[PDB]
Amino acid sequence: EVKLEESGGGLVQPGGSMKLSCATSGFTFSDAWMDWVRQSPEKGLEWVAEIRNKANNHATYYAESVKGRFTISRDDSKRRVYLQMNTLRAEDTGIYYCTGIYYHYPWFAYWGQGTLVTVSAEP
C-alpha cells in the first residue's frame, strides 16, 4: 500500500526557515520523481518543486515563486524527500503535500495528508 507522510510544518515568522520531511513506502522510490505541492485559499493548489530520479541525476525544478529560497532534496536510501524553505514569506503559508510521478505516468497518483506551514508575524 502506497504511504506518504509529511512532517515538519509549524508556525514561523516572515524571513524564517523550516525543513519539511516526507517518509514513503509502497512504491519503487529510486526511479520515482518526487514533488511538493502546496495549498492555500489564496492560490489554491500549486506545484512547488520536483526532484527527478538517478536517471536524471536528481535534476531539481522549482516554481518561479520559490526559486532561490526553497531547496528540494531526497535520500534514496531512506526513501524520503525533503523541502528546505528559507527566507519564508507570508504567501508561502499553506498545507504542503508530498506526492510524485513516474516518467511514463506523469500524474500525482498519491498524496500524503499534508503538513501545515504558517508564515505570520501576528494573529
Binding site: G44, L45, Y97, P106, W107, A109
Partner: protein
C-alpha cells in the same frame, strides 16, 4: 504557465442528482506524444487530494463507475451520474502536459441545504 479554469465555483446538489463540472485550459493539453494529460482530483475537507480520473477519461484504481470524464484540447468535463455522500468535497482539474503542472481553482460539490 498554463492557466486552468473551473466552473462553477460551487455546485450545490441533492443526493442522487446529476453533476457536471467544467474545466478549461489556456492552451491545448494535447501532448506531442499524442496523449492528453488532464486529470481530476477530489479533496474532502481536512483531507488531501485523491486522484479520480487521469488522461481525460481513465478512472483511477478504486474509483466507482458513477464518475466519468470527457473533453479534448482546451475543454473538458467531469460528470457524476448520481451523487453520493462520499463524493462531497472539492474537485480540481490539473494538467501535466506542460511544465510546470498547474491546477484549476476547484469546484465545491456540496449538499443543497
Amino acid at each position: 504557465d498554463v492557466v486552468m479554469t473551473q466552473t462553477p465555483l460551487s455546485l450545490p446538489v441533492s443526493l442522487g442528482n446529476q453533476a457536471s463540472i467544467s474545466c478549461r485550459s489556456s492552451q491545448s493539453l494535447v501532448h506531442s506524444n499524442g496523449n492528453t494529460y488532464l486529470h481530476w482530483y477530489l479533496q474532502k475537507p481536512g483531507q488531501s487530494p485523491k486522484l479520480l480520473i487521469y488522461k481525460v477519461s481513465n478512472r483511477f484504481s478504486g474509483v466507482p463507475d458513477r464518475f466519468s470524464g470527457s473533453g479534448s484540447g482546451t475543454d473538458f468535463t467531469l460528470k457524476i451520474s448520481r451523487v453520493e455522500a462520499e463524493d462531497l468535497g472539492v474537485y480540481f482539474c490539473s494538467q501535466s502536459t506542460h511544465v510546470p503542472f498547474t491546477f484549476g481553482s476547484g469546484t465545491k460539490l456540496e449538499i443543497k441545504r
